[PDB]
Design a protein around this motif. Structure first.
Motif, PDB file in Angstrom:
ATOM      1  N   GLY A  84      13.624  17.073  92.094  1.00  0.00           N
ATOM      2  CA  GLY A  84      14.741  16.508  92.832  1.00  0.00           C
ATOM      3  C   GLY A  84      15.611  17.472  93.622  1.00  0.00           C
ATOM      4  N   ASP A  85      15.074  18.635  93.993  1.00  0.00           N
ATOM      5  CA  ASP A  85      15.870  19.608  94.745  1.00  0.00           C
ATOM      6  C   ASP A  85      16.147  19.130  96.173  1.00  0.00           C
ATOM      7  N   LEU A  86      17.416  19.081  96.544  1.00  0.00           N
ATOM      8  CA  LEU A  86      17.765  18.717  97.906  1.00  0.00           C
ATOM      9  C   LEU A  86      18.396  19.897  98.649  1.00  0.00           C
ATOM     10  N   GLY A  87      18.181  21.106  98.138  1.00  0.00           N
ATOM     11  CA  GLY A  87      18.677  22.302  98.792  1.00  0.00           C
ATOM     12  C   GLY A  87      20.178  22.477  98.663  1.00  0.00           C
ATOM     13  N   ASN A  88      20.814  22.868  99.761  1.00  0.00           N
ATOM     14  CA  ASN A  88      22.257  23.034  99.800  1.00  0.00           C
ATOM     15  C   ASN A  88      22.847  22.114 100.842  1.00  0.00           C
ATOM     16  N   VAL A  89      24.062  21.645 100.589  1.00  0.00           N
ATOM     17  CA  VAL A  89      24.845  21.057 101.666  1.00  0.00           C
ATOM     18  C   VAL A  89      25.883  22.066 102.136  1.00  0.00           C
ATOM     19  N   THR A  90      26.354  21.894 103.366  1.00  0.00           N
ATOM     20  CA  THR A  90      27.326  22.827 103.927  1.00  0.00           C
ATOM     21  C   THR A  90      28.652  22.126 104.155  1.00  0.00           C
ATOM     22  N   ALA A  91      29.684  22.571 103.449  1.00  0.00           N
ATOM     23  CA  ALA A  91      31.018  22.042 103.648  1.00  0.00           C
ATOM     24  C   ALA A  91      31.737  22.863 104.708  1.00  0.00           C
ATOM     25  N   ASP A  92      32.384  22.173 105.647  1.00  0.00           N
ATOM     26  CA  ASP A  92      33.108  22.821 106.735  1.00  0.00           C
ATOM     27  C   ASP A  92      34.541  23.208 106.327  1.00  0.00           C
ATOM     28  N   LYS A  93      35.360  23.613 107.297  1.00  0.00           N
ATOM     29  CA  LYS A  93      36.710  24.099 107.007  1.00  0.00           C
ATOM     30  C   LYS A  93      37.676  23.010 106.559  1.00  0.00           C
ATOM     31  N   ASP A  94      37.265  21.753 106.682  1.00  0.00           N
ATOM     32  CA  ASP A  94      38.031  20.632 106.152  1.00  0.00           C
ATOM     33  C   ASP A  94      37.462  20.167 104.803  1.00  0.00           C
TER      34      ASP A  94
ATOM     35  N   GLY B 235      26.215  26.638  88.046  1.00  0.00           N
ATOM     36  CA  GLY B 235      27.594  26.205  88.099  1.00  0.00           C
ATOM     37  C   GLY B 235      27.814  25.191  86.995  1.00  0.00           C
ATOM     38  N   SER B 236      29.046  25.106  86.501  1.00  0.00           N
ATOM     39  CA  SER B 236      29.365  24.165  85.431  1.00  0.00           C
ATOM     40  C   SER B 236      30.198  22.997  85.950  1.00  0.00           C
ATOM     41  N   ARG B 237      30.954  23.232  87.018  1.00  0.00           N
ATOM     42  CA  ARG B 237      31.773  22.171  87.590  1.00  0.00           C
ATOM     43  C   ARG B 237      30.986  21.446  88.656  1.00  0.00           C
ATOM     44  N   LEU B 238      30.736  20.169  88.397  1.00  0.00           N
ATOM     45  CA  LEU B 238      29.920  19.351  89.257  1.00  0.00           C
ATOM     46  C   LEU B 238      30.704  18.156  89.729  1.00  0.00           C
ATOM     47  N   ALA B 239      30.286  17.629  90.859  1.00  0.00           N
ATOM     48  CA  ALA B 239      30.614  16.266  91.194  1.00  0.00           C
ATOM     49  C   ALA B 239      29.301  15.547  91.004  1.00  0.00           C
ATOM     50  N   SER B 240      29.336  14.355  90.427  1.00  0.00           N
ATOM     51  CA  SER B 240      28.083  13.644  90.219  1.00  0.00           C
ATOM     52  C   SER B 240      28.206  12.126  90.250  1.00  0.00           C
ATOM     53  N   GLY B 241      27.050  11.470  90.332  1.00  0.00           N
ATOM     54  CA  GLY B 241      27.012  10.021  90.237  1.00  0.00           C
ATOM     55  C   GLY B 241      25.595   9.542  89.988  1.00  0.00           C
ATOM     56  N   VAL B 242      25.451   8.396  89.329  1.00  0.00           N
ATOM     57  CA  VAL B 242      24.121   7.863  89.046  1.00  0.00           C
ATOM     58  C   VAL B 242      23.601   7.160  90.292  1.00  0.00           C
ATOM     59  N   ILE B 243      22.330   7.369  90.598  1.00  0.00           N
ATOM     60  CA  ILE B 243      21.740   6.741  91.764  1.00  0.00           C
ATOM     61  C   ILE B 243      21.431   5.267  91.446  1.00  0.00           C
ATOM     62  N   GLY B 244      22.134   4.350  92.103  1.00  0.00           N
ATOM     63  CA  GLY B 244      21.978   2.932  91.820  1.00  0.00           C
ATOM     64  C   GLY B 244      21.238   2.183  92.912  1.00  0.00           C
TER      65      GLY B 244
ATOM     66  N   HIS C 285      26.916  24.457  98.993  1.00  0.00           N
ATOM     67  CA  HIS C 285      26.956  23.882  97.648  1.00  0.00           C
ATOM     68  C   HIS C 285      25.603  23.289  97.239  1.00  0.00           C
ATOM     69  N   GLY C 286      25.099  23.718  96.085  1.00  0.00           N
ATOM     70  CA  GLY C 286      23.835  23.239  95.550  1.00  0.00           C
ATOM     71  C   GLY C 286      23.841  21.733  95.360  1.00  0.00           C
ATOM     72  N   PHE C 287      22.738  21.081  95.711  1.00  0.00           N
ATOM     73  CA  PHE C 287      22.700  19.613  95.834  1.00  0.00           C
ATOM     74  C   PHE C 287      21.341  19.124  95.341  1.00  0.00           C
ATOM     75  N   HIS C 288      21.318  18.363  94.253  1.00  0.00           N
ATOM     76  CA  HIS C 288      20.000  17.969  93.741  1.00  0.00           C
ATOM     77  C   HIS C 288      20.064  16.869  92.710  1.00  0.00           C
ATOM     78  N   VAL C 289      18.913  16.254  92.452  1.00  0.00           N
ATOM     79  CA  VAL C 289      18.823  15.232  91.423  1.00  0.00           C
ATOM     80  C   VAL C 289      18.547  15.940  90.115  1.00  0.00           C
ATOM     81  N   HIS C 290      19.327  15.608  89.087  1.00  0.00           N
ATOM     82  CA  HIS C 290      19.159  16.218  87.766  1.00  0.00           C
ATOM     83  C   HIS C 290      17.750  15.986  87.253  1.00  0.00           C
ATOM     84  N   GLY C 291      17.120  17.057  86.779  1.00  0.00           N
ATOM     85  CA  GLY C 291      15.757  16.986  86.293  1.00  0.00           C
ATOM     86  C   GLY C 291      14.804  17.684  87.243  1.00  0.00           C
ATOM     87  N   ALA C 292      13.511  17.447  87.046  1.00  0.00           N
ATOM     88  CA  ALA C 292      12.472  18.028  87.887  1.00  0.00           C
ATOM     89  C   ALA C 292      12.228  17.204  89.156  1.00  0.00           C
TER      90      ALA C 292
END
Length: 110
Positions: free
Chosen positions: A52-62, A98-107, A43-50
């Motif tokens: 901020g690319d964090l590559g991909n994370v890997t989700a396991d079978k759970d 992708g259009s469906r995201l999980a997201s949150g503001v970095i606080g 799953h693509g993983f990054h900070v919105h904007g320029a």
């Protein structure tokens, strides 16, 4: 800032907590935490904007993706500080847009 946290919220069971730590103003940033409720695979993983690319994370079978990255591109201080920017993960597995995201503001934590 020296520490920051993003609380990721998405559709259905998708949710996560990602931590950012930086000892020194120009130094590397440790990114760590986990995201759950994901489909298995990449799953693509990054900070919105320029810069901020964090590559991909890997989700396991759970549906769990553990995150443990050191990145020297992003920063918690300075002009392109990621503080206040939005961290996103693509809910759709695999590459491309992708259009469906999980997201949150970095606080600020510390």
């Amino acid at each position: 800032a020296t520490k920051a946290v993003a609380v990721l919220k998405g559709d259905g069971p998708v949710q996560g907590i990602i931590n950012f730590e930086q000892k020194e103003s120009n130094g590397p940033v440790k990114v760590w935490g986990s995201i759950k409720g994901l489909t298995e695979g990449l799953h693509g993983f990054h900070v919105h904007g320029a810069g901020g690319d964090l590559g991909n994370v890997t989700a396991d079978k759970d549906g769990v993706a553990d995150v443990s990255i050191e990145d020297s591109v992003i920063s918690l201080s300075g002009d392109h500080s990621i503080i206040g920017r939005t961290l996103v993960v693509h809910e759709k597995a695999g590459a491309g847009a992708g259009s469906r995201l999980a997201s949150g503001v970095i606080g600020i934590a510390q």
